[PDB]
């Protein structure tokens, strides 16, 4: 997941199983003040939903990850 944060400007999140890509894009905008280029979602073998959120070029995903505090 961190290779995507670095190479692809993509933040990888665990997301609620009931939420769609419109709600995920709004949620990341409201929580972290960042614009998503796209949201690719996925349901994992353990039953949880993972979102690959690519940010627009205006935002640096590594900076957002440090700001959240997991890198």
């Amino acid at each position: 997941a961190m290779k995507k944060v670095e190479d692809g400007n993509t933040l990888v999140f665990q997301v609620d199983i009931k939420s769609n890509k419109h709600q995920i894009k709004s949620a990341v905008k409201e929580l972290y003040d960042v614009d998503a280029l796209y949201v690719n979602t996925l349901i994992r073998p353990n039953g949880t939903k993972k979102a690959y959120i690519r940010l627009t070029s205006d935002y640096d995903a590594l900076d957002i990850a440090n700001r959240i505090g997991y890198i």
């Binding site: 349901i43 994992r44 073998p45 039953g47």
Partner: protein
């Protein structure tokens, strides 16, 4: 198969999560009687029947 329903994949997620060994700190509790997980399941041995 690769083409599976959501209801099927949700049952397979729960079946994967129930197929774990006993956490070892549980054997140290007072009056503990569980020595191992007795409900293990191997894919080739016992089928889920889903």
């Amino acid at each position: 198969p690769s083409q599976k329903s959501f209801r099927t994949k949700q049952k397979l997620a729960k079946a994967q999560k129930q197929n774990r060994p006993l956490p070892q700190w549980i054997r140290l509790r007072t009056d503990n009687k569980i020595r191992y997980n007795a409900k293990r399941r191997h894919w080739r041995r016992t089928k889920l029947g889903i």
